[PDB]
Design a protein around this ligand. Structure first.
Ligand SMILES: COc1cc2cncnc2cc1OCCc1ccc2ccccc2n1
Ligand SMILES: [Mg+2]
Ligand SMILES: [Zn+2]
Length: 305
């Protein structure tokens, strides 16, 4: 059972999951039980599932088991603060999608895989890693005793896998730019309709970006240390690009590491702030994410001064 400090702090958007890995599963179960119900998943089956998902995450600096659970917590926080909007099945599927959304990530982008001519890129031409993460998710469900949706009907099962599939694919940031533009026009024309399945899919997609990006919504000491992990992977991919005979983009070039603050400014401007701004417009209780993003932009501006 959860420590009293975590019972309180877990409800904050800026919660950090801590360095104790054996606690992360209990944190996720509590999150599922609080959002979905304890009558929802059989405990042993869900535990079996969680530990296999863990096992198929890699020892990479950033896109690891910790990140999975952190993205799921952000989703939990969004869902707790917007009671009545999402169905039980949506809530179940979104938390599970978040836990799985980076399954078997190698710390390299879709662009590197394409350039490498990895087998996976011939299989999945667009959103390569994300199609793979979802394939992995399915393969784990299909393991003996790992089907956490076994009490659902065939229909609900197909429905929740579809919810999971679109949410994982939406974690391909390449898709976020289009999705956010569609959403922003819907907002401003008064045309967003959460009873329209295609609009609903968009909002969920944006929630998935928001959760996936949530390092920028933590308090600054957390945000600042997390950027160490993010760049550790980007710089490794840049080393790999150099080895293919290809100049990496500056973000991945460790020789341009002094330009990190400027690069962070760019990201907050072009991606993070518009993301949380659009999210708060659709879901006003998500405002603390946007406030914390702005605070972090200011800190990056301070670093530059
Ligand atoms: C919190 O920071 C980031 C989170 C991400 C999350 N997903 C995908 N890309 C992400 C990128 C992020 O920042 C990289 C920003 C960036 C851009 C150009 C750069 C050029 C040179 C040096 C550093 C740079 N940094
Ligand atoms: Mg990803
Ligand atoms: Zn992720």
């Amino acid at each position: 059972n959860l420590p009293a400090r975590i019972c309180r702090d877990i409800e904050l958007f800026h919660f950090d999951i801590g360095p104790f890995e054996n606690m992360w599963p209990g944190i996720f179960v509590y999150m599922i039980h609080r959002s979905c119900g304890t009558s929802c998943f059989e405990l042993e089956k869900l535990c079996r599932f969680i530990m296999s998902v863990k096992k198929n995450y890699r020892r990479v600096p950033y896109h690891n088991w910790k990140h999975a659970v952190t993205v799921a917590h952000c989703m939990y926080a969004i869902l707790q603060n917007n009671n009545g909007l999402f169905t039980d099945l949506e809530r179940k599927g979104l938390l599970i999608a978040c836990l799985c959304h980076d399954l078997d990530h190698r710390g390299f982008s879709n662009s590197y895989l394409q350039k490498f001519d990895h087998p996976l890129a011939a299989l999945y031409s667009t959103s390569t890693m994300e199609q793979h993460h979802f394939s992995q998710t399915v393969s784990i469900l299909q393991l003996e005793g790992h089907n956490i949706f076994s009490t659902l009907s065939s229909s609900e099962y197909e429905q929740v896998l579809e919810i999971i599939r679109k949410a994982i694919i939406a974690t391909d940031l390449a898709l976020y730019f289009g999705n956010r533009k569609q959403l922003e026009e819907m907002y401003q024309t008064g045309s967003l309709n959460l009873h329209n399945q295609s609009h609903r899919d968009r909002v969920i997609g944006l929630m998935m970006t928001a959760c996936d990006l949530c390092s920028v919504t933590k308090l600054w000491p957390v945000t600042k240390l997390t950027a160490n992990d993010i760049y550790a992977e980007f710089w490794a991919e840049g080393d790999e690009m150099k080895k293919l005979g290809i100049q990496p983009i500056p973000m991945m070039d460790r020789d341009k590491r002094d330009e990190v603050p400027q690069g962070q400014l760019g990201f907050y401007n072009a991606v993070a702030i518009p993301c949380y701004t659009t999210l708060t417009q659709i879901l006003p209780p998500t405002e603390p994410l946007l406030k914390a993003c702005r605070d972090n932009l200011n800190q990056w501006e301070k670093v530059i001064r």
